[PDB]
Design an enzyme around this catalytic site. Sequence first.
Site, PDB file in Angstrom:
ATOM      1  N   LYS G 153       0.665  -1.293  -0.216  1.00  0.00           N
ATOM      2  CA  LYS G 153      -0.108   0.002   0.079  1.00  0.00           C
ATOM      3  C   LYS G 153       0.923   1.226   0.237  1.00  0.00           C
ATOM      4  O   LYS G 153       0.965   1.943  -0.922  1.00  0.00           O
ATOM      5  CB  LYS G 153      -1.106  -0.488   1.098  1.00  0.00           C
ATOM      6  CG  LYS G 153      -2.086  -1.056   1.282  1.00  0.00           C
ATOM      7  CD  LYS G 153      -3.121  -0.974   2.119  1.00  0.00           C
ATOM      8  CE  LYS G 153      -2.267  -1.069   3.949  1.00  0.00           C
ATOM      9  NZ  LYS G 153      -1.997  -2.181   3.659  1.00  0.00           N
ATOM     10  N   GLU G 179       0.448   6.220  11.336  1.00  0.00           N
ATOM     11  CA  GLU G 179       1.309   5.804  11.215  1.00  0.00           C
ATOM     12  C   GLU G 179       2.963   5.892  10.816  1.00  0.00           C
ATOM     13  O   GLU G 179       2.739   5.509  12.419  1.00  0.00           O
ATOM     14  CB  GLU G 179       1.430   6.792   9.240  1.00  0.00           C
ATOM     15  CG  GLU G 179       2.488   6.709   8.066  1.00  0.00           C
ATOM     16  CD  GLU G 179       2.559   7.764   7.699  1.00  0.00           C
ATOM     17  OE1 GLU G 179       2.254   8.840   7.959  1.00  0.00           O
ATOM     18  OE2 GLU G 179       3.538   7.776   6.278  1.00  0.00           O
ATOM     19  N   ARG G 180       3.863   5.420  10.714  1.00  0.00           N
ATOM     20  CA  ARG G 180       4.895   4.917  11.151  1.00  0.00           C
ATOM     21  C   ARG G 180       5.540   5.863  11.461  1.00  0.00           C
ATOM     22  O   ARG G 180       6.098   6.589   9.950  1.00  0.00           O
ATOM     23  CB  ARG G 180       5.862   3.560  10.450  1.00  0.00           C
ATOM     24  CG  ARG G 180       5.057   2.310  10.987  1.00  0.00           C
ATOM     25  CD  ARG G 180       6.085   1.016   9.319  1.00  0.00           C
ATOM     26  NE  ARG G 180       5.254  -0.353   9.342  1.00  0.00           N
ATOM     27  CZ  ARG G 180       4.174  -0.367   8.526  1.00  0.00           C
ATOM     28  NH1 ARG G 180       4.196   0.754   7.766  1.00  0.00           N
ATOM     29  NH2 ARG G 180       3.450  -1.085   8.902  1.00  0.00           N
TER      30      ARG G 180
HETATM   31  N1  LIG Z   1       6.316  -2.752  -6.333  1.00  0.00           N
HETATM   32  C1  LIG Z   1       7.578  -3.080  -5.704  1.00  0.00           C
HETATM   33  N2  LIG Z   1       8.070  -3.256  -6.467  1.00  0.00           N
HETATM   34  C2  LIG Z   1       8.553  -4.454  -5.368  1.00  0.00           C
HETATM   35  N3  LIG Z   1       8.790  -4.733  -3.609  1.00  0.00           N
HETATM   36  C3  LIG Z   1       7.234  -4.301  -3.391  1.00  0.00           C
HETATM   37  C4  LIG Z   1       6.904  -3.489  -4.092  1.00  0.00           C
HETATM   38  N4  LIG Z   1       5.965  -3.537  -3.909  1.00  0.00           N
HETATM   39  C5  LIG Z   1       5.692  -3.791  -2.250  1.00  0.00           C
HETATM   40  N5  LIG Z   1       7.060  -4.384  -2.228  1.00  0.00           N
HETATM   41  C6  LIG Z   1       7.361  -5.212  -0.932  1.00  0.00           C
HETATM   42  O1  LIG Z   1       6.596  -4.884  -0.474  1.00  0.00           O
HETATM   43  C7  LIG Z   1       7.507  -4.050   1.114  1.00  0.00           C
HETATM   44  C8  LIG Z   1       6.255  -2.717   1.357  1.00  0.00           C
HETATM   45  O2  LIG Z   1       4.641  -3.535   1.555  1.00  0.00           O
HETATM   46  P1  LIG Z   1       4.617  -1.588   2.041  1.00  0.00           P
HETATM   47  O3  LIG Z   1       4.549  -0.255   1.492  1.00  0.00           O
HETATM   48  O4  LIG Z   1       5.103  -1.413   3.118  1.00  0.00           O
HETATM   49  O5  LIG Z   1       2.736  -1.928   2.371  1.00  0.00           O
HETATM   50  P2  LIG Z   1       1.862  -2.161   3.238  1.00  0.00           P
HETATM   51  O6  LIG Z   1       1.936  -0.404   3.998  1.00  0.00           O
HETATM   52  O7  LIG Z   1       0.804  -2.255   2.631  1.00  0.00           O
HETATM   53  O8  LIG Z   1       2.743  -3.049   4.533  1.00  0.00           O
HETATM   54  C9  LIG Z   1       8.730  -3.341   0.694  1.00  0.00           C
HETATM   55  O9  LIG Z   1       9.773  -3.531   1.613  1.00  0.00           O
HETATM   56  C10 LIG Z   1       9.038  -4.643  -0.765  1.00  0.00           C
HETATM   57  O10 LIG Z   1      10.234  -5.697  -0.177  1.00  0.00           O
HETATM   58 MG   LIG Z   2       2.187   1.680   5.151  1.00  0.00          MG
END
Ligand SMILES: Nc1ncnc2c1ncn2[C@@H]1O[C@H](COP(=O)(O)OP(=O)(O)O)[C@@H](O)[C@H]1O
Ligand SMILES: [Mg+2]
Lengths: 57, 74, 74, 147, 456, 456, 456, 73
Positions: G153, G179-180
């Site tokens: 996300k 958020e973090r």
């Molecule tokens: N487009 C992408 N390409 C590569 N890795 C991705 C991508 N989108 C998500 N990730 C992977 O997932 C993680 C990011 O998730 P995050 O954005 O923090 O999701 P959420 O906020 O929903 O938990 C990254 O550390 C990576 O390992």
């Molecule tokens: Mg997040």
Amino acid sequence: AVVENNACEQAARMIAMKNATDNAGELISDLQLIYNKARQAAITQEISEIVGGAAAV
Amino acid sequence: NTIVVAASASESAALQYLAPYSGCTMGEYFRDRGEDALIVYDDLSKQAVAYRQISLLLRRPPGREAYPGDVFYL
Amino acid sequence: NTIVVAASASESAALQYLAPYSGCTMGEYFRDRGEDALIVYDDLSKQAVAYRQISLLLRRPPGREAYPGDVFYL
Amino acid sequence: NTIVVAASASESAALQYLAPYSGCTMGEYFRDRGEDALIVYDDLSKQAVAYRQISLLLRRPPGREAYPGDVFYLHSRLLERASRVSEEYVEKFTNGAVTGKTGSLTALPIIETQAGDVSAFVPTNVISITDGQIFLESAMFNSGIRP
Amino acid sequence: SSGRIVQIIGAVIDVEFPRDAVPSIYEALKVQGVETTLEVQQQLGDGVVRSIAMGSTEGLKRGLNVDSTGAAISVPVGKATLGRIMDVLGNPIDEAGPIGEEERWGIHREAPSYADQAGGNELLETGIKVIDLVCPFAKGGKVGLFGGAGVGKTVNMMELIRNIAIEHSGYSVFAGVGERTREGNDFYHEMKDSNVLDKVALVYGQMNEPPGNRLRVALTGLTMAEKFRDEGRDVLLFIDNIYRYTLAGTEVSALLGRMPSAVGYQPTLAEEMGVLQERITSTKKGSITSIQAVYVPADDLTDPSPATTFAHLDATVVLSRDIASLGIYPAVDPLDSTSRQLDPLVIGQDHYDTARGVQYVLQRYKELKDIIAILGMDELSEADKLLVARARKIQRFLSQPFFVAEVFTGSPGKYVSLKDTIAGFKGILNGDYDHLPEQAFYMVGGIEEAVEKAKK
Amino acid sequence: SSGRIVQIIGAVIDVEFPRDAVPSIYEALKVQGVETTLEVQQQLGDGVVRSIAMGSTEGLKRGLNVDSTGAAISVPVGKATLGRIMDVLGNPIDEAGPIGEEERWGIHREAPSYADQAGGNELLETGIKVIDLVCPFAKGGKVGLFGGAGVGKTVNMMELIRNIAIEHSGYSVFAGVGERTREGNDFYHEMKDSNVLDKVALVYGQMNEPPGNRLRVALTGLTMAEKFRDEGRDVLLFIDNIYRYTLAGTEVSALLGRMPSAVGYQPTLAEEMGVLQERITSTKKGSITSIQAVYVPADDLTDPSPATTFAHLDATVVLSRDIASLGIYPAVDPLDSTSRQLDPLVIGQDHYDTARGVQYVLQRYKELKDIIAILGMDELSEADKLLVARARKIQRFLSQPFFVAEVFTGSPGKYVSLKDTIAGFKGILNGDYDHLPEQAFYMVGGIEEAVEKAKK
Amino acid sequence: SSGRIVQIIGAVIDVEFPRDAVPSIYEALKVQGVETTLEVQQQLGDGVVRSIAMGSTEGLKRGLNVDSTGAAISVPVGKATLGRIMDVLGNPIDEAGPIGEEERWGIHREAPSYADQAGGNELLETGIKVIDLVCPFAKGGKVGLFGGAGVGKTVNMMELIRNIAIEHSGYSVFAGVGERTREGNDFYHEMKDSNVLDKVALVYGQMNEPPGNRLRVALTGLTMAEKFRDEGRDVLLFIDNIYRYTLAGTEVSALLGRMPSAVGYQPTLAEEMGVLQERITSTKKGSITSIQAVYVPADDLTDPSPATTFAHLDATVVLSRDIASLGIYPAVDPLDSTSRQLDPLVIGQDHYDTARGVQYVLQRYKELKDIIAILGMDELSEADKLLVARARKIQRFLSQPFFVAEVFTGSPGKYVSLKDTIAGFKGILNGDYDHLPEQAFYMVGGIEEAVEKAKK
Amino acid sequence: AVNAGISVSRVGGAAQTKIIKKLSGGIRTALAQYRELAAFAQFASDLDEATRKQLEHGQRVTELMKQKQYAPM
Ligand SMILES: Nc1ncnc2c1ncn2[C@@H]1O[C@H](COP(=O)(O)OP(=O)(O)O)[C@@H](O)[C@H]1O
Ligand SMILES: [Mg+2]
Ligand SMILES: Nc1ncnc2c1ncn2[C@@H]1O[C@H](COP(=O)(O)OP(=O)(O)O)[C@@H](O)[C@H]1O
Ligand SMILES: Nc1ncnc2c1ncn2[C@@H]1O[C@H](COP(=O)(O)OP(=O)(O)O)[C@@H](O)[C@H]1O
């Protein structure tokens, strides 16, 4: 002998696929009993939580 | 040669919960006097359902499958 | 090179609830002074069980799996 | 040819709970006068959610899925109004002004299921109350079979 | 100064005392005419205390006088307790007259400190193939036998009592907590007839007993074991069923005015286990080796009681109804069972690699269950077919005829050394017995007996 | 003396009475100046009683006067009730004027005592071939009716209503528990058009009525049936849906604030079912037999409602969509239908052997039909081909023309005795009629009529 | 006149005021001598109000004096808020000193009337293949990124901010709800270093803050966006986790004296969500284009929070844990994701047919996947074998490397236009790439990059 | 026992030294793709060079990721 063995192979395959169809029916039946048991437990737990929370408020 | 104790499907849950202990007490009369007896409880699962009703009406907290905490002690 | 903080199974639920914060405060001493530290929390699930016990005994209203509403904030 | 009754997501739960009865009352005007009407309740599940909120805040005892003991009565009281009335009923109601004509109110209530689960408390109640059901499937919708 | 009973609800009794004479928590009280003993649990305020009765409450009434004894429930300890049977309060229940104790100890005590803990990994051979292979025990450690109803917790514990008493010369303590009264009589006559009784202390609080007795009897048995440990001895502590101690707390928790937690358990579930379990430990003075049977409600291993118990043990033996249904006994699950002693630095690389090899084969066979049920073994690769044949032989070779189980089948019991255990499983894994039929490994003590059975 | 309304919460009304004039549990109360009736459920103390309204509470206010009737809800009984539609309180809901009753009975009473039980097990001859052979009904028994919609459920009820009245001099009562107003109106006209309305009493508890109305309608219909039983008759009691009776109890129990049981059902689930079902029995004066439609939640036969209901059923009739497609009526499945009286000790060896013989042939034909469909008719042996011919004749001989179905079938109705039924199927199984064509057995009263039809 | 604190339990505080000076609902109160603000939630009667703290409770005591401010929480609005970081109360949390505010607005407001609603449908190109293909966005509409923990996300929202907000001519607002703290700081430095910060107002409420902060930050950020919309501007509104607004309500609900609903959520869940979601909308004065990240508890889309959120959005993008588990990113589910803009009258027949063509192939492959795992690929028909190869190529061609994800992927980011996207999927569907290997389409960008990767 | 498909790090390459950052690039997603391919092709009669090569590499990297306790690198 080769042509007759091919007729026997298809007959053996018919029986094998009938048995595979029947064994899948048993697995579906066992899983359905486990599913119904899990369905009933979830409703009972949720009601315990609703009653428990309402008694504290 | 048999004593029949009855607590039918329409009798009060208190009597259904207590019937096994009344039958047991009548059977114990022979045991304590040096004799042999046999007892049949036609449905202990119906006794547990009767005890669950009294416990829920007394508002005691339920456990697994909504049975009382003391259903094992019963 | 290690500080060991212990809140064993027989200790008060309040000590088990506070131990992660005590270890964190001991680890923050190095962070605020321009140094690096590493902290391991044995089981955050056991700290949550200790907090649930205190919260239920204080009669605060429970949520999912009987945990208090603020278990996320903990 | 349509009357639109709205009770939006930001409106008081009382208005959302009452909206189906208000719309039904506006539809019944035609039934009792020897005419035909059709009513659509876009979410009877949302009406039940609004009634559950009012019941819990009024501290009424909860049941399955936290709904009150009268959640079946809520929908049954609404859905039995949708009906076809005889010529004698129309003649009696209109004091003889409308003669030899029947009146009716047809209902198309809508319910939302979670992952195809028709066994949930509110869906089970409405399925038992209604004269029939049109089931829509996610697998068919993805397979190009739009209706 | 005496107090008066103000309320009675089941096993819980409220007593009112003068504001200047309120009894402390865990203090023992006695009802004047009936002599029933009560243990104070909470101070409600305004001079009222809440207590649990250590006996039947039938026939008690409001207004009866209650005396406070000035101390907690105290039981006899030391040599005078050996070869005798006691109840929760420490009274003799074997009709053999009064106990001759030199001192009495209160049943409530603090656990030994962090500085008093003893470190040790000395291997204990059980003579049981599956236990000696995948979950080895250590002297002064804690063992738990987890299982549902009817799977074998008592039969396995009786075989362990029989086998461990061969190399142990010290004292033993057996605590019967919420189990069958018949099992207590059977064990007592077995030891009396075998002349082993003078080395064992027996404490019993069975199913017939009220909630108060089943809630404290585990402390009475443990208090006797702590006297022997503190005298510098090595003692064995057996608990007939540790789950019953937890259940007695659940039966009384609502009466004590506490809010229920998940699935109706007391909010204090983990603390009640920790206060008991930390006392069952070896120290720098002496050691306690303990075996505990752990009941699993409705066969659900995720239930809060079994789930909270795993963290307190050194070796975990998990029994399974599926394995017992195939006629394989002792019925231990090799994939769910484990021990901290299963370490290359403790048991050596040969034993460690053999146990790891057995678990690898059984895990791979488990993954093929649904494929085999629908299509059979013929659709598997040649590598999978070889592994399935060895997995089926390993499952059968884990079975063993027990000496205590001879009454159920007439088959003589077998004792197997660790040397013979490692040699048998290693040979099956390496393919030395690929030609033997799988039925040759069922109910055979050693690999040599499998070779002889294959000739029939 | 009268009381006053003190609190109104939806359908639950609390009324305060003078300390010496508090009404009894289940006593009916009347609100002054309004047609609202209340049933006392609990006595709260201080002269306050908790009651459930038997109608809409809209427009009621605190302080209204309430009069005690001195008895439970009382309903009209006897011949005056036949051919009329009534509500839960016994009021006529049709526009045909007031009921001419000579007597009224309270809806609450105990089941007939152990000494009143009729004793010997006697069959109820329905006059329907498939029912009387495969799933016989005992006098005083409870029959579970299963199936969908559009499969002949109303026509079967109308035929049973005709046969008990014309062939056995009995009467019928229909209890519409949670009845749909559209279907209740359609059913009333279908019985009038079929000339069976004057042989049955109708009680409707419509879906739009409060929980108390839907819960008590079963007792109102049962009270009317108890009067006819005491006149020395055999009576049929039809319950529209026994599942809705269970749900009405759950709704009322939730309104009263009782703690819910497993799956959310009322804690009194088994007792409420027992209070209703134990009155339906065979007594020394006469009997009440009941046909009850059953709904299974989520298709789960282990759910508390189906599981509690099945403990009381003596027979199960299963209606089939597939059998109705073949033009066979009534559309009853001979393999899925069951009966506790289908025992050689209850019905005798001759009836039992004939019924089991028919079921064996039909079961084997079901299997052979799959072989014919997948491999073709040339795979079957001469013994199998003969069995298929007999199975087709048996399957058609189970069909029957009903007096209430003369509009649909054209042919005149037939009542078939048990003697004629057993003799007909026994003869076909023995091969005595193997020379007749299969079409001769379709829509005929007895085997004689099949022999005569074969000449046309 | 001032009141006094009477009780403190967690984040909920009770304050007693003179009966003629009781504060209104949502009115802000200030504690004397302590830097803490309270928002009134309920009037309990007898001059007592219940409130939630907008700061830490460690410094609070019973008996402290409390002042009524006469209005709701009021925050600074307009041009002065751009390029600044603020807390829930509108204080600057950056070190740039006091905000040059000229006007303040209360955070509580009624939603726009039915007559003020907009109707725009202008398409918005995102540069992301899956989104531009099956979830086309529109200017002034609401977008939701649904997904469990770790499915992408934030990474998807950051790519959308790069491809939309950097090139945008108007103002942007970012609300960090629960958020973090690390993500907030990383985003601030990225906007600052990119020279984009001057167009963005930042409002943060991290997950270390009291429930009152997390419950109101969404309103503070939205209040700033409403000021710009009402000025007649076009605004972008980003929310990192709208679920945190709901969760903060759940943490406090039971302490506010409310009984729990299904799944333990507050009874007011749908109303609390609707009161916020109906304000995030485009009107006749100006437009708000909003992207909201929506957390899905335990990946279950049926949970009451995600289930209630779908009805409020125009475009629903569902991120699947099963797709992310295959190493395929952005992980957007082509069958569960949808948009109100997916209509031939809005996007033309070529795009619509290409989108439905991809969905048809993927839906058919889902039901063949389980067969291959049991019987193998060779047991399928000629048409199924060909279709499975195309489905596996389409599934990989949906993947794309993002500029904001170079830190995870190591490879450079790619931007793909709508025409390039349509041409690529039409070619794979029509069979123009049946000769390329399955691995050539994974993490490449446009269709020519797959042709080039296949040669390597 | 690290499940590479379900496990994830939100800091990624920023938490690694330059040598391990360049050499380990894409390994996590490659093992995740190998798990799906190894299950899909379990009963396949024959496979192309790209598939054969991916399975051979995936098995070697799966074997390389194993390590003993108390033996850091
Ligand atoms: N487009 C992408 N390409 C590569 N890795 C991705 C991508 N989108 C998500 N990730 C992977 O997932 C993680 C990011 O998730 P995050 O954005 O923090 O999701 P959420 O906020 O929903 O938990 C990254 O550390 C990576 O390992
Ligand atoms: Mg997040
Ligand atoms: N080797 C064995 N042979 C036969 N029965 C066995 C064996 N091992 C265990 N059992 C079974 O174990 C059961 C007793 O164990 P269990 O009921 O779990 O213990 P507890 O007495 O503590 O409840 C009996 O049914 C017994 O038949
Ligand atoms: N005995 C019968 N003979 C011929 N047709 C029948 C018979 N019984 C039922 N049917 C057909 O089935 C239809 C529906 O029957 P009905 O009893 O009303 O079923 P249901 O109440 O479930 O809808 C009838 O209108 C008639 O067409």
